[PDB]
Design a protein around this ligand. Structure first.
Ligand SMILES: CN(C)S(=O)(=O)n1cc(-c2nc(-c3nc(C4(c5ccccc5)CC4)n(C)n3)cnc2N)cn1
Length: 820
């Protein structure tokens, strides 16, 4: 029975569970036993949750960050629907009451026993919120479409739930013995070593003797640090390089084990290929024992030595600087450490960075303060997750403060909280426990954590950790694992179909490839596999029947697939599409869209909706991911082609954009589209300036028929070809209602840019903490300090709001002066 569940996890996580046993590692084995138990306890509490608490799990409320409307409501066991005239200020309960009252008159004879499902979607409408607070209601309000909802009784929700049940004495200096190696390079081999506590050295780097390219050393490597002065999270970093300078390989390893004991004696280090000394890199060796270079080293015995328990640890001009600092300034903060705890709690990061981690006496005093430190705000806790703060006690304190994250906030920073797992030193961590816990408490987080892990199973350095986490997750939800398997089955078929599409395009005409895509899709295995699955881009979006005749592929290099769906129940909300792309890395594209989505959220909170189109984009595997189709939209380029026998017949190229709008928004409807275009253009002007998105042209900027402008292809960001502000006459013409001179409309638009820019600037540090946590991903255009600096400069965070708004107008006018 459980053998199949074991076999299913294996196929789903892309790694056989036998591989975890083969290693014969007590860290892997104890992670698996503990996590499985923690995950089963989380699945248990979930099986005894009240029917509303289950809705908050399976279907978490999609709520937005007066005027009456028509709402079509039906029940389960019938096709009979009723169309009401409810208000946007109405709670769902009142609508639930009307549905029950109108059911009573039809059937000739309580709303607290119901939930309003969104037709053909895993989304529901419940809670003490007026209808206009629900994202589905607002999407129906702007598009003028009618909300189709189903009355789902408590027992029918409980049916779902039931059918888804599962020490100070060692004063000697720290030393090692560098024995021999087994590598490849064409010169002499020097092995530089070093001791690290995060980004910083605990003592000066000590090198090896230049031994011939042919390698044996047997050398003694002593460090400028005491054995009792090694912090718990001490990292020993190595670097193999050839010289007559050229790097070869790198390896790191913790001086303490997962059981807190100091490591002894012989250790073989399967090194990772190099591009100086890399302290950020993984403390687990290269899994390719066949082609990897090795480093045998000795950890000399000093006897069993365990790091002291917290009980033994606990037993042992100021304001003007608190807004990169000199040694006298550092000494001040450490002297004033108690006054920091008491009156400046948010300064903890600056106090943690000044403490001497190379002295056990210092660390303990700091830890005594930390154990009595008040909870920091979410923003302050997000800063503490960086590699800059490696201490376990610090790491735990950050999670302790992060527990007040709303499931909404957690979903906005999950990509960063997953990347941060790469910085980890051991498999068993409070971050994993947290991520897993929240994943098992909320299925949307459960879904997205999985895909963020699964999309990296091909990267050897993180394959064990991630594979292990996904396995632990799968223990806490047998049902969801089965649902995630259907997603993997669709994606498996999609890659095979794409592979054919790629070959056929190199051999025949497009209508010929398109018809055989269809033939291949119409097969039993493809028809079943690609149908009735929760979208990997949004688990609430149900990709029901695959609309094969409406499926094509794109002419761009990697021949992306256009997969259109339809649902009877959902009707028009069921008419959804997904773009499968295979060959490019969708990580930056996703991060950029997420950063845009956040900007929209920060703006929407301050009552400003700049009509942004933050379409889904999710990497699912090796250079494989999905893109959300923005239906009823086309590229500026295609609209500018100006085809004959159309309604968009333009005399001048400038008119093409506005003529297009005029045909898609007839009569009075056009006035709306121009405000849509102005608001979205303003938003994307700021977004792309702040983020530094370059290589913009008509082929990667799109328009919705609604008027809404948006951007695609974010392969380049942070000015990586200092990019200027962007302004095109084709857009200014549209903003100015199609008139040569209309400054009333243009100066209102100049306001939209300024306001959006100032709101973002107020959360500059949020973008700074999120990007600094992202560095863990290994994104080539987000690899160092120079990259974070682009954001610091585009957001002018080292200047006041007045000095920044003037400096912005300067960039805005120079973008307007370049506009023809
Ligand atoms: C740069 N890329 C190719 S991409 O990076 O793959 N990418 C596409 C998107 C994307 N596109 C569209 C869209 N595109 C087309 C068009 C079309 C469709 C089908 C066959 C041939 C042409 C180009 C007319 N329409 C009509 N819609 C919608 N929502 C998206 N989210 C985002 N990123």
């Amino acid at each position: 029975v459980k053998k199949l569940i074991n076999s299913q996890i294996s196929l789903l996580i892309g790694k056989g569970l036998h591989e975890f046993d083969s290693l014969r590692d007590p860290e892997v084995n104890d992670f698996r036993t503990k996590m499985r138990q923690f995950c089963e306890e989380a699945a248990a509490h979930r099986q005894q949750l009240g029917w509303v608490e289950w809705l908050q799990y399976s279907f978490p409320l999609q709520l937005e960050p007066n005027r009456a409307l028509l709402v079509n409501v039906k029940f389960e066991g019938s096709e009979e629907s009723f169309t009401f005239q409810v208000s946007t200020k109405d709670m769902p309960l009142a609508l639930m009451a009307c549905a029950l009252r109108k059911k009573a008159t039809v059937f000739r004879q309580q709303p607290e026993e119901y939930a309003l499902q969104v037709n053909g979607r895993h989304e529901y409408l419940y809670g003490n919120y007026p209808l206009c607070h629900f994202q589905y209601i607002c999407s129906c309000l702007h598009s003028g479409l009618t909300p189709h909802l189903t009355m789902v009784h408590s027992s029918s929700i409980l049916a779902m739930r039931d059918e888804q049940s599962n020490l100070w004495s060692l004063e000697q200096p720290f030393s090692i013995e560098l024995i021999e190696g087994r590598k490849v390079n064409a010169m002499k081999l020097v092995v530089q070593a070093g001791l690290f506590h995060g980004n910083e050295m605990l003592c000066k780097t000590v090198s090896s003797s230049e031994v011939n390219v042919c390698p044996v050393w047997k050398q003694r490597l002593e460090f400028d640090i005491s054995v009792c002065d090694l912090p718990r999270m001490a990292r020993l970093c190595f670097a193999l390089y050839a010289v007559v300078d050229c790097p070869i390989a790198w390896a790191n390893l913790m001086l303490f084990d997962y059981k807190d004991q100091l490591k002894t004696g012989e250790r073989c280090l399967y090194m990772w290929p190099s591009v100086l000394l890399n302290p950020a890199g993984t403390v687990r060796g290269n899994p390719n024992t066949e082609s990897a270079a090795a480093l045998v080293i000795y950890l000399p015995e000093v006897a069993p030595v365990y790091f002291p328990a917290l009980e033994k640890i606990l037993e042992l001009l100021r304001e003007i600087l608190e807004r990169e600092l000199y040694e006298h300034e550092k000494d001040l903060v450490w002297k004033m450490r108690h006054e920091v705890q008491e009156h400046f709690p948010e300064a903890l990061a600056r106090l943690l960075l000044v403490t001497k981690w190379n002295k056990h006496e210092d660390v303990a005093q700091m830890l005594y303060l930390l154990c009595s430190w008040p909870e920091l705000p979410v923003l302050s806790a997000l800063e503490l997750l960086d590699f800059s703060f490696p201490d376990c006690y610090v790491g735990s304190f950050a999670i302790k403060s992060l527990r007040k994250l709303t499931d909404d906030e957690l979903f906005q920073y999950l990509l960063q909280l997953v990347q941060v797992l790469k910085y980890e030193s051991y498999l068993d961590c409070e971050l994993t426990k947290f991520l897993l816990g929240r994943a098992l408490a909320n299925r949307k987080i459960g879904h997205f954590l999985f895909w963020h892990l699964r999309s990296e199973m091909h990267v050897p350095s993180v394959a064990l950790r991630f594979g292990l986490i996904m396995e632990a997750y799968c223990r806490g939800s047998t049902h969801h694992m089965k649902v995630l398997m259907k997603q993997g089955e669709a994606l498996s078929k999609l890659k095979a179909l794409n592979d054919f599409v790629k070959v056929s395009s190199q051999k025949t005409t497009k209508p010929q490839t398109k018809e055989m895509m269809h033939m291949c899709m119409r097969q039993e295995t493809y028809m079943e596999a690609l149908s009735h699955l929760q979208s990997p881009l949004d688990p609430s979006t149900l990709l029901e029947e695959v609309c094969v005749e409406q499926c094509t592929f794109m002419d761009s290099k990697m021949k992306p697939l256009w997969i259109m769906y339809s649902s009877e129940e959902a009707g028009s909300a069921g008419n959804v599409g997904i773009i499968f792309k295979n060959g490019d890395d969708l990580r930056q594209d996703m991060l950029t869209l997420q950063m845009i989505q956040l900007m929209d959220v920060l703006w929407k909170q301050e009552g400003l909706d700049l009509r942004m189109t933050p379409y889904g984009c999710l990497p699912t595997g090796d250079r494989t991911g999905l893109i959300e189709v923005v239906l009823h939209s086309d590229t500026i380029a295609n609209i500018q082609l100006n085809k004959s026998n159309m309604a968009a017949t333009a005399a001048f190229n400038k008119d093409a954009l506005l003529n297009w709008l005029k045909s898609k928004n007839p009569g009075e409807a056009l006035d709306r589209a121009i405000e849509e275009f102005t608001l979205s253009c303003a938003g994307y002007c700021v977004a792309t300036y702040v983020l530094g998105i370059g290589d913009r042209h008509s082929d990667n900027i799109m328009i919705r028929e609604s008027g809404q402008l948006f951007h695609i292809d974010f392969g380049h960001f942070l000015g990586n070809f200092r990019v200027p502000f962007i302004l095109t006459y084709d857009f200014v013409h549209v903003i100015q209602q199609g008139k040569t001179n209309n400054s009333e409309k243009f100066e209102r638009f100049r306001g939209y840019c300024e306001r959006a820019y100032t709101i973002l600037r107020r959360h500059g540090l949020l973008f700074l903490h999120l990007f600094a946590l992202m560095r863990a991903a290994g994104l080539p255009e987000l690899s160092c300090s120079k990259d974070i600096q682009y954001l610091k400069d585009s957001l002018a965070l080292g200047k006041t709001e007045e000095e920044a708004l003037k400096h912005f107008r300067v960039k805005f006018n120079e973008a307007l002066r370049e506009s023809w």
